[PDB]
Design a protein around this ligand. Structure first.
Ligand SMILES: NC(=O)[C@H]1CCCN(C(=O)[C@H](c2ccccc2)n2cccn2)C1
Ligand SMILES: [Zn+2]
Length: 139
């Protein structure tokens, strides 16, 4: 679990969005596993606007942060799960690191701010849904 709070927006994994997220929906994209909802309180986070390919993410299943090298956002095949059919997920970045069910939502940050959230895992890999292209989160 986990979310990004920026301005009057809450960014979560679409597959973990709550009834309240859907009732306050701003934008969602099943192909990216992202959903953004509106909030009444001002957020605590700021978003990176950069091309960093290294950073640090939070891994809830280890209660620890780990440094990673990750690929640029791209279209990657993701196997069928309880939440989605087999499909290509867009804007996804892979890295070598620990991620198991329950780790989705952990934040990946670089020196410029929040880069994205954990969205996939297994096999010693971790995938992050990028948010750096969502320029409207900042206004
Ligand atoms: N973006 C998606 O389509 C995700 C939706 C939820 C299922 N997905 C996973 O990767 C997870 C998982 C999560 C976090 C670390 C490891 C595994 N999972 C694999 C097998 C069983 N669960 C894919
Ligand atoms: Zn950066």
């Amino acid at each position: 679990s986990g979310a990004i709070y920026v301005g009057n927006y809450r960014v979560v994994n679409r597959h973990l969005a709550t009834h309240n997220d859907w009732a306050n929906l701003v934008w969602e994209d099943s192909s990216r596993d992202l959903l953004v909802s509106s909030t009444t309180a001002q957020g605590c986070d700021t978003i990176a606007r950069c091309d960093c390919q290294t950073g640090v993410y939070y891994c809830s299943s280890r209660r620890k942060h780990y440094p990673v090298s990750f690929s640029k956002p791209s279209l990657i095949f993701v196997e069928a799960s309880e939440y989605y059919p087999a499909r290509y997920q867009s804007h996804l970045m892979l890295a070598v690191g620990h991620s198991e069910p329950g780790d989705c939502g952990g934040i990946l940050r670089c020196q410029h701010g929040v880069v994205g959230i954990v969205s996939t895992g297994g096999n010693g890999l971790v995938g992050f849904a990028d948010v750096r292209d969502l320029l409207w989160l900042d206004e």
